[PDB]
Amino acid sequence: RFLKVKNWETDVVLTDTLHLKSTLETGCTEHICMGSIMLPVRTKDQLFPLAKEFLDQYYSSIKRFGSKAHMDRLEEVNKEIESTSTYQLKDTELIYGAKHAWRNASRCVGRIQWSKLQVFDARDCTTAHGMFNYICNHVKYATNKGNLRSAITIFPQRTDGKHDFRVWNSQLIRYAGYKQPDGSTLGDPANVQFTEICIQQGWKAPRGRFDVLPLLLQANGNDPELFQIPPELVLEVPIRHPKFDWFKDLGLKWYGLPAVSNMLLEIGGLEFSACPFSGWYMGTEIGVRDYCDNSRYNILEEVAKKMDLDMRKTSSLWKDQALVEINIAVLYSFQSDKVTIVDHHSATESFIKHMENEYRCRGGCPADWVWIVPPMSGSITPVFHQEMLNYRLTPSFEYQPDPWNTHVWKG
Amino acid sequence: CPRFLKVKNWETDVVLTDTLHLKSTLETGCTEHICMGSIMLPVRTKDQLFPLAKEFLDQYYSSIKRFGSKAHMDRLEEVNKEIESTSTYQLKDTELIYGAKHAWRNASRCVGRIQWSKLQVFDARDCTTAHGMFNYICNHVKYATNKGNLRSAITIFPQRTDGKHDFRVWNSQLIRYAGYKQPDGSTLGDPANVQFTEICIQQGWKAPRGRFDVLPLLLQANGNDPELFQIPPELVLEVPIRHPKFDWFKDLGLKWYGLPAVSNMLLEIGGLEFSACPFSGWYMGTEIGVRDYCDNSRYNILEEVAKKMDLDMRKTSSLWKDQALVEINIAVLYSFQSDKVTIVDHHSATESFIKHMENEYRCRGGCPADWVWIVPPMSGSITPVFHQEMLNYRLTPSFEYQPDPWNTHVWKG
Numbered sequence A: 001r002f003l004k005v006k007n008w009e010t011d012v013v014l015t016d017t018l019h020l021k022s023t024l025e026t027g028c029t030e031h032i033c034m035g036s037i038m039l040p041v042r043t044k045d046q047l048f049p050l051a052k053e054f055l056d057q058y059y060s061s062i063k064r065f066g067s068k069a070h071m072d073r074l075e076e077v078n079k080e081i082e083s084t085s086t087y088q089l090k091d092t093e094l095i096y097g098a099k100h101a102w103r104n105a106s107r108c109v110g111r112i113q114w115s116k117l118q119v120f121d122a123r124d125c126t127t128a129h130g131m132f133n134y135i136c137n138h139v140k141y142a143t144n145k146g147n148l149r150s151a152i153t154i155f156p157q158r159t160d161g162k163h164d165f166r167v168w169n170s171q172l173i174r175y176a177g178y179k180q181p182d183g184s185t186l187g188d189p190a191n192v193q194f195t196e197i198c199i200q201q202g203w204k205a206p207r208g209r210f211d212v213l214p215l216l217l218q219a220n221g222n223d224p225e226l227f228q229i230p231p232e233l234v235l236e237v238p239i240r241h242p243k244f245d246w247f248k249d250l251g252l253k254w255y256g257l258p259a260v261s262n263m264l265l266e267i268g269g270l271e272f273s274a275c276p277f278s279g280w281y282m283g284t285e286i287g288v289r290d291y292c293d294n295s296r297y298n299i300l301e302e303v304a305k306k307m308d309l310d311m312r313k314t315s316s317l318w319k320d321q322a323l324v325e326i327n328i329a330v331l332y333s334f335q336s337d338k339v340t341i342v343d344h345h346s347a348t349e350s351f352i353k354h355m356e357n358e359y360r361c362r363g364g365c366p367a368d369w370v371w372i373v374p375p376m377s378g379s380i381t382p383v384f385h386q387e388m389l390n391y392r393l394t395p396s397f398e399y400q401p402d403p404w405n406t407h408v409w410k411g
Numbered sequence B: 001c002p003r004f005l006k007v008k009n010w011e012t013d014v015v016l017t018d019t020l021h022l023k024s025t026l027e028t029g030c031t032e033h034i035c036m037g038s039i040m041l042p043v044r045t046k047d048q049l050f051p052l053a054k055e056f057l058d059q060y061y062s063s064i065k066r067f068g069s070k071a072h073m074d075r076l077e078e079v080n081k082e083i084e085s086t087s088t089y090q091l092k093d094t095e096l097i098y099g100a101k102h103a104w105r106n107a108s109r110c111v112g113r114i115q116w117s118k119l120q121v122f123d124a125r126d127c128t129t130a131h132g133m134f135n136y137i138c139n140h141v142k143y144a145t146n147k148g149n150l151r152s153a154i155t156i157f158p159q160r161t162d163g164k165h166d167f168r169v170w171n172s173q174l175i176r177y178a179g180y181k182q183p184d185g186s187t188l189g190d191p192a193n194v195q196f197t198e199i200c201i202q203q204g205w206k207a208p209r210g211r212f213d214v215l216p217l218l219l220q221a222n223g224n225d226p227e228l229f230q231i232p233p234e235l236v237l238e239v240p241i242r243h244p245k246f247d248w249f250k251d252l253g254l255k256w257y258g259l260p261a262v263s264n265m266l267l268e269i270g271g272l273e274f275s276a277c278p279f280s281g282w283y284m285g286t287e288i289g290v291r292d293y294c295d296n297s298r299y300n301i302l303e304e305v306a307k308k309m310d311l312d313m314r315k316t317s318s319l320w321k322d323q324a325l326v327e328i329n330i331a332v333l334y335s336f337q338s339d340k341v342t343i344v345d346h347h348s349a350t351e352s353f354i355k356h357m358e359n360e361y362r363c364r365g366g367c368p369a370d371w372v373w374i375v376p377p378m379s380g381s382i383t384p385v386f387h388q389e390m391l392n393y394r395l396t397p398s399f400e401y402q403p404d405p406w407n408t409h410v411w412k413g
């Protein structure tokens, strides 16, 4: 019930007590560990304990636990749930709640930054055009000419579940994917389906390798509409290598702003179905995953060939050599254009420090080791050697179904 | 518990269905509210033993297509009588073999399990003394080594009786290098083995105090105090490590041994406990090139290698550590291959593991696997295992951790 975690490199032991505050399920049981599975409206009665759980932590955090201000608020919210079946967060509660969803994000290595989050309150939004305006402002604010700043933009909460706000895009900025008669895929194969939805809805696709996709925005449960982010708001970086002059001829670019837009933010039982957020990239995200996953841009072979490595045998480690070089190029390119990026060494040692702070001041830090350890050079990063406990704390970011599987089209 | 559990591979969209987990019996360290997936380490009664014996022998008899047979029923009767009368029982040779193979088949942290049915089992249950254990262990090493053409094997010493007469190998592996803490706080040799090296010295080993000294065997028989033995050097196959392009690599002075032989685990078969059960396969290169050489708390050669490569070491973002890592790993695979000693690279091993795992789902209904251990410690996502969802659970027979015997031994003196 009080749990120890060991770092096997430093022999440091931390004691976790925060896990006892954990509320929802992990996926696992006593008999079966599901640590590596990617994916393992509320009635009045459901809502009040959740509202209360949240307000208590809020009031505790501002050192007014058990105060009249505290008691006053619980009653006010109580009355409001009873009368209107939902409630509205104060701005202070909204900001605290968003910062804490990030703080509690077990899969995010960058949480040392958690309290420096710009929160844009878009709860007054009513239309998809409004949503477009809001999202452009977020993109421009967070991009900040390459000196990126963390931000989240929060659209109105779910009500009856028939008036949901949604960003159909999985990130605000991503590249199109197109199935070819050639049998192959042009662009990013992760986005084939979504691209096709855009086309069905009217988009005129350029049909290139790196077409920034349009926004498909859904307000108040209505049908989604298309918008193009002003090109001048989308900062992109051409990818070159500091030693290989041929690298630029591969014709690779990526975007500077990673902005997850398909998750659900839960605060105090309230569900914010449209809550796009952004920080900045860890290099491996692009260089290892986006570029080298076989089901993504899958570029290892092309690169290995230009390096003229021995590709006849796996044991020459040609894949490993090429992987490192692709990742060097990513970091060098972002750095040279002054676009914020963090390498996996820097990011993981910051995370270990954050864990130690969180253990010290909070009693723990939920972490998913499977996601936190980078997808290259794992054991030469400190997090590989760190035992971590994964559990679910609220406020939280949650996965939610892709809206086209569920949207009841009006036509 | 749900009858069916699905696992998906996110590279291929292949979905597999696990039913085998229903035969899982012991616990994980996980609860409904906590996942302890990344945590390293989270005598029996007559009553406790009957059912464990029974479960096992039903599995054994089922596997040989003789389930429910008179032979099956006689054998159950015989074991039941043996347990009631003697408090324990003895396995038949065929059952010991099947047992050991299955402990390997069920080892969720082993990526080499495509090999599980090809295992040489050495029955050392007639062993009574530490000199006897030395001789069994020498034979295992020579057989397994096979002049570089490595053969998987296990040597099984007598099972636990009352817990006061345990056979133990005090070494963590049959072959490993000494570590020596210096008065200045540096370590000469392998820091992982500093504690065991001090024990050996105390027991009377005359340490050469070099960087790669093969440790002596420290063997406990029948609950007696451990005794020291030197493995004949002619039996210890080692590989000097060089790089195919960097002729300075050899002057690092690195080598390693060819035979990885875990010697400190406990093998459970039908409720019986084999506390001494050294087993060996062959190396996947990363064990040596990533962990043994490059962990900060092991040989820690990254800086020295990067220095000789003249990488830019002022900023992590040059990925100099990463670049040196790959070159060290090329060198390990190249050196072993050049000397004709079996080694597998992490690409080939993981590809084979995924093939093995698919086959096990079809023919067996499952394959328990611990992702944290199965994914290699470099280049994780360019191996297929990274993209494969895994279910980790405990099947018996099993290999299990046990405390270090120096923490528990009652010294006779």
Ligand code: HEM
Binding pocket: A102, A105, A107, A108, A109, A110, A111, A113, A117, A150, A151, A152, A260, A277, A278, A279, A280, A281, A282, A285, A342, A347, A371, A397
């Ligand atoms: C500030 C710099 C940040 C860095 C360096 C960072 C780093 C990362 C990385 C490397 C991942 C793994 C993503 C993947 O593998 O696809 C991740 C996931 C995640 N992060 Fe962050 N992050 C940052 C900002 C944020 C912010 C601002 C939030 C929320 C406001 C956040 C919440 C999350 C969540 C909820 C996940 C899991 C997403 C999923 O399951 O797909 N992160 N983070």
Ligand code: HEM
Binding pocket: B100, B103, B104, B107, B109, B110, B111, B112, B113, B115, B119, B152, B153, B154, B262, B265, B279, B280, B281, B282, B283, B284, B287, B344, B349, B373, B399
């Ligand atoms: C034949 C070639 C083999 C290969 C390539 C192989 C591969 C591996 C690797 C890479 C690990 C992780 C070790 C570490 O990170 O320290 C491992 C662990 C393990 N393997 Fe194997 N193995 C082989 C043979 C065997 C055999 C013959 C057995 C038993 C008969 C076995 C049972 C185990 C067990 C119980 C573990 C967990 C060890 C621990 O928890 O410290 N392996 N294997």
Ligand SMILES: C[C@H](O)[C@H](O)[C@H]1CNc2nc(N)[nH]c(=O)c2N1
Binding pocket: A036, A037, A038, A370, A371, A372, B010, B386, B387, B388, B389, B390
């Ligand atoms: C199956 C397994 O969960 C999957 O491949 C995971 C592995 N760890 C991850 N880690 C991060 N950061 N991002 C991911 O997408 C993955 N995917």
Ligand SMILES: C[C@H](O)[C@H](O)[C@H]1CNc2nc(N)[nH]c(=O)c2N1
Binding pocket: A008, A384, A385, A386, A387, A388, B038, B039, B040, B372, B373, B374
């Ligand atoms: C804390 C974490 O479990 C620990 O460092 C693990 C990680 N995965 C591993 N994987 C393998 N194969 N071998 C190990 O020793 C480790 N150690």
Ligand SMILES: N=C(NO)NCCC[C@H](N)C(=O)O
Binding pocket: A171, A258, A259, A260, A278, A279, A280, A281, A282, A285, A286, A289, A290
């Ligand atoms: N660093 C972040 N967010 O701030 N990553 C968000 C997910 C991005 C996704 N991994 C990609 O490579 O596009």
Ligand SMILES: N=C(NO)NCCC[C@H](N)C(=O)O
Binding pocket: B173, B260, B261, B262, B280, B281, B282, B283, B284, B287, B288, B291, B292
């Ligand atoms: N492949 C095996 N056995 O066959 N590994 C056993 C553990 C070896 C340990 N990882 C080492 O590097 O010494």
Ligand SMILES: [Zn+2]
Binding pocket: A028, A032, A033, A034, A035, B030, B034, B035, B036, B037
């Ligand atoms: Zn688990």
